[PDB]
Amino acid sequence: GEIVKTVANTVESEIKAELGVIPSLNAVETGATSNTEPEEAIQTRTVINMHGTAECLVENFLGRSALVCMRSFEYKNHSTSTSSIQKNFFIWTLNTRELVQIRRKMELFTYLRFDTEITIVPTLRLFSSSNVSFSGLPNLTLQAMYVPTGARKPSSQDSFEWQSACNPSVFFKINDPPARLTIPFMSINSAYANFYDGFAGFEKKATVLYGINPANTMGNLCLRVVNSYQPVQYTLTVRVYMKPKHIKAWAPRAPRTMPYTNILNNNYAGRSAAPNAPTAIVSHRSTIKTMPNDINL
Amino acid sequence: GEIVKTVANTVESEIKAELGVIPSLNAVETGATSNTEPEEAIQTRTVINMHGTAECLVENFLGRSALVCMRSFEYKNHSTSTSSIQKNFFIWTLNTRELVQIRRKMELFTYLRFDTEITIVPTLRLFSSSNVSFSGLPNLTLQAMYVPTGARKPSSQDSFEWQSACNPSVFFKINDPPARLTIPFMSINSAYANFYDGFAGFEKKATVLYGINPANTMGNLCLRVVNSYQPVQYTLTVRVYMKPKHIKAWAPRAPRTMPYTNILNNNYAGRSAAPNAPTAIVSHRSTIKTMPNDINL
Amino acid sequence: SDRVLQLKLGNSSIVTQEAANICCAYGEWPTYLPDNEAVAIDKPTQPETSTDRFYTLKSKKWESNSTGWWWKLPDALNQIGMFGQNVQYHYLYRSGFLCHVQCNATKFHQGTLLIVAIPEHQIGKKGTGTSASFAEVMKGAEGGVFEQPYLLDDGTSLACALVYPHQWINLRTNNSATIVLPWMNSAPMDFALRHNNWTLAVIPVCPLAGGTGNTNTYVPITISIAPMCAEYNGLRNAI
Amino acid sequence: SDRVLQLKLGNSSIVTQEAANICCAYGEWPTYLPDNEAVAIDKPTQPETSTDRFYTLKSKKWESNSTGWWWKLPDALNQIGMFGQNVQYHYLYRSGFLCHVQCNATKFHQGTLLIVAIPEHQIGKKGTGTSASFAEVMKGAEGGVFEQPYLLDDGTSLACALVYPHQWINLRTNNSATIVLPWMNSAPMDFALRHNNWTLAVIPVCPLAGGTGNTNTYVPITISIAPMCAEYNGLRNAI
Amino acid sequence: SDRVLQLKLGNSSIVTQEAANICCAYGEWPTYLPDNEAVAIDKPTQPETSTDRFYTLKSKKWESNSTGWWWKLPDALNQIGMFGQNVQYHYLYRSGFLCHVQCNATKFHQGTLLIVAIPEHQIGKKGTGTSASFAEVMKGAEGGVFEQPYLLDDGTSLACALVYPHQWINLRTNNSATIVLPWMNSAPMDFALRHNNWTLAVIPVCPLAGGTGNTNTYVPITISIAPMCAEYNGLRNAI
Amino acid sequence: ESMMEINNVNDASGVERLRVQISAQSDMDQLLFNIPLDIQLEGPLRNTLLGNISRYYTHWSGSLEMTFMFCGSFMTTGKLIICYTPPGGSSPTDRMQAMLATHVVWDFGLQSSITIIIPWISGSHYRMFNTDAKAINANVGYVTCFMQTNLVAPVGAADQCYIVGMVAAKKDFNLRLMRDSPDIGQSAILPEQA
Amino acid sequence: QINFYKDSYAASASKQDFSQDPSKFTEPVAEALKAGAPVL
Amino acid sequence: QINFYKDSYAASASKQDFSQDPSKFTEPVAEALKAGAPVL
């Protein structure tokens, strides 16, 4: 294990006709990748490469803020003949699989240990009714409440589970900067697992699903409009962004090829024809001797 | 009294067949909890436990911001034929019992000494009238005025008790961040008491109620809309959050089982059937030999 | 040292041979109020032998269906001896209490009592908003009975009463329990007539029983309480 | 040193003369759980020779149209020998695995197998939302077959399976592959019956073929797995 | 030290308050087989916590006419827990045994048991030349009953059984007996299925009795046996 | 230590629920009572100091102690076997199966109580207070009590005695991820009177 | 702790005090119980 | 890194660790392969 701030330098190489030395030949059967250097495969010049590697660090590769949740509910009076339930909120059931870019990028490793910075971005639209005159978006107070595993969830906007005396909650308005906080590495294990070759229950029943991990039960995010209902219908759209920090990554995986279909498993249907079809990942060319983008003069 | 930053380590233990040594037997009659170690009850391995204890500190357990007050008044012209009273305010009579999560959590100790950070979160809704066209929430100035014990209270929005020349008051608008301040430990005694086995008056009359403490007379919070009445009716909802700081706690109590019914006493009705019924706190199972969640294969 | 104990305060001396230990509430012994913690500026009266001695209260019959009994301190001793007179004649009191519960039965009898010293025990009433009356709360030396011992008459739990300084009388092991109470108040002194620092509670967790010829046996429960480091301030007429 | 290798664990000893090397997964050898990483406080049972030895599973016929085979560890060995009994009788297990795949053919035969140790290999099913059943996932010593080896039965690629600890059996060069697996879990121990740390997969990348008189030759593939530094915690009845 | 004893082996912990002492058979404690005494050259499996722990067998009703009971070791534990599995899976075994016999009665009850660890106890049958059948000799965890306890079922005498490591359960003095057995064989290891080193025998010398209201009392006898320094050699398939 | 509702049955009321009726058996090796170890679910451990305060958290780790006080007669004798079965399969109903797990044999006498240490035996550093009891993240296993010999009482003493069970945490105990306890609920702002 | 204000009570959550004495509640007995000893 | 908060996990992206050991994945063989040597 050596320090690599810049890519390897190239050393000047000479003609070499030596018996018993075959640097260009390797045995792939050992499981070892070819160790052949350019210096010993061709005649090379001295090159002092000052290309930096900091952008290919797993901290930089995974430590960008990615969307992990998009939920939209109608902000209005949901009350009817006999309901008494205001329903101006949503519950998510925390996960990192709903959006494929962060999922496929996280799924390039088996295990990840990171503290996560979260950013919530709310947006309002007036609901296009029969008689609706627009004149501006109310500066509503929102409450995002993390309900951990085994805590009572809210059933209404007006519920008293919103007390949040011990539940972590953040209050933030529409016209303010998007809410932000850091959640620590909060697994019962020493790393998060993107794949579980097993079951999360002690029973052998169908109801006990394959792939579900007994460390991904992370609880729920409950987000409400704190303001009581307006005289008109609004649509609140909430976007939650995840930025992994202080990242450790283990056991790199084969990248996902087929499009995801759900968040409970890694099943696939594949696309009808190449690319990313079950029988053809790379698009077809005419023959093994055909260059599809051959430069013609 | 020792320092505990991490939980106790486990020491490797061997087979032990020794006369006169019975570490697994205790006398519960002494009032002392069992002193039996795992090391001396079973054969153990060496374990170096690096689990931290900072999250179970009474500073962390009680020092979260909890809701302690929710009051809503109508912001409008309350004037009539002959009233001349604007009534666009409320008075609370400070306490910490109206909301059960902070109450039950505080009531786990007999005595608490803490300085308290307060956060006020206001919210507006347009009142759903017969003819009401919404277009946005006015950035109203609010005044929260602490009226200490024996001071004149305001009778109207337009009262001159709002002078607050010596009464602590905070001015804060709707579209600003929620108002915040720290109230010091302000008891006539060396700690706050969650329970008073006695009376707060020298007389023996019915009017002198049991459980009321002559140190919980903390005065009142009076909150007003500083802005004069709008041409339309608004509903202002105020939420007050309490965060204990610099906490000392004494004499831990048996946790509350029955649901609270009022803020003047600790009386109960209990729920009709288990759980938390007067005759059954824990839910029923078929028999003492029945496992209700028995794992079947 | 053993299972035997002699408690000697002033005139009084109690001996027991089936003891367990002495429970020092929160590992503390009662002491006189120091100057650094003093509020009332008048010189206090410290009557040692005349007040700091065992006052034996009226006994209670342990029945098969006994719910349990409580005594509120200092209310229990406020109309008894020189402790009472000093209370009646002074505005302020401070004292600890050495409580000693006694219950004799045969080796053939079975039964268990939890003896709990509960600080600031605010009695909750079942099925009403009305708070407990002066009569229900202030019963003096006669003490009170538990209606809901399961809930500690608080909407709490008997189960979790072991937070509080406690012992057991298990007739197998023990005929007597002893709890040393120090001063428990947010203030250094208080008014004895209108506030109780402690509540000594005796709850039968396992009922009193015998076999064929030891049923319906007359088994009383006797409580002896000794004020410890008693102080009084505010000498006035008697109330 | 050369192309020859003898593996000796307890009773067992395997020899090969057409080897390539030993693949130590992530350049690590299995070791016993240290105290600094220990969670379960009970003294673990470390049966060396009775568990840490080569268990040979049932062989598979390499066909011209063979898609490939996988064995999930420890599920493959959970009903075999003293490793199985210690699994059946304990809540927690920890072990590495020395896997040794064997395939004999002539110098006239052609064919190539990729032998992959995939950690936490979650099987994805083609053309359904329904996740794989207990039966499909837990096949024990018999192992399972690849339906979509091209996609590693994961919606991933066989192409990129060389991230994983792997060797090849190229009948030109090699008749045997050897992969040393260390403990791979976010936790120090796990429950053997409901989670597999590793999946040993044998995929034919180049098919088995011969010339005119070496077609339809009977060529089996034999797998021998040796648990390494096996530990068990939570001694109970057998499940 | 006293009449109280706690035995702790692996998962297991037994406590008694009416003990006598611990009988170390021939003043020796069980130890692992040394190299100077070793015969079998294969590395042995030493599972400490999984085998060296208290296995409680099925209880026996002490009757007024009870002749007595015996359990042959290791036959009693050969189909129980990880000791059984290691026996079933290995040719050779070596272990000592910590035997603990339990019998509770009242202070009004009378009765005495001799608890004898007899080495190489060859059962003699009365009134026949035919030697005892496999069934009669190998009864496992259920154990056997004495037909002629007076003769130790050997043509010997119960009288002279005190040569053997022994204790008594005299209900006046004792509710539990404890005998530590070391390895007793002319060879360093043996085949568990076809030879028993020890026979733990429980013989009522004085019968179980009570007075007027303590007759026909249900008094069981419980036996808990802990293998000590268990070793196994000759790892094969299970028999 | 805090008492457990081991007798949480629809025939026991109030203080009846905190004691376990132990009797002389006309049988041997029989199971007397069980204890579920699902702190999150409605079980004997819920209304304990461990339960109520741990139920303010989501994650927990460490060994538990469970102490049983025998409350019969001085003249009544007996031997019990209390066993902690780690999770994986069904709760034991035979003593032959239970004895194979972590257990303590209890002889009644001058020391009236016994402790069984429920030792920290889990793959993960922490367990979760989860609504799914059968989850690998949540399940602790089983505590079961069988007769080792029997309960023996002379005619003068009652045949039907009682056991009181207490549970506490050891010094190796930890809690994380604070939450609002589900023990207490609210439908409205609590009024002054009603 | 930091505190940008004049008063000391205005400061943030106090510096973690990890002192524990559970003996106050777990062994509040005049004569201390010795580990392994018959405590009668 | 800077961190204005009490907890260490609240800090910004961690100081760049430029340590590389691709041999874990590229040459995970018991006997090391020598450059130029026939690796058989």
Ligand SMILES: Cc1cc(CCCOc2c(C)cc(-c3noc(C(F)(F)F)n3)cc2C)on1
């Ligand atoms: C797999 C996997 C899962 C994770 C952790 C994801 C973080 O989950 C969240 C998210 C996305 C948001 C909040 C959150 N947002 O707001 C709040 C608050 F308001 F309660 F503070 N909490 C909390 C958690 C644990 O990391 N890997």
Ligand SMILES: Cc1cc(CCCOc2c(C)cc(-c3noc(C(F)(F)F)n3)cc2C)on1
């Ligand atoms: C019991 C008990 C009671 C307490 C103290 C509670 C703090 O009470 C308050 C609250 C909740 C708010 C304010 C307050 N809010 O705003 C203002 C201001 F505007 F006047 F500054 N004061 C003042 C006090 C004393 O602590 N324990």
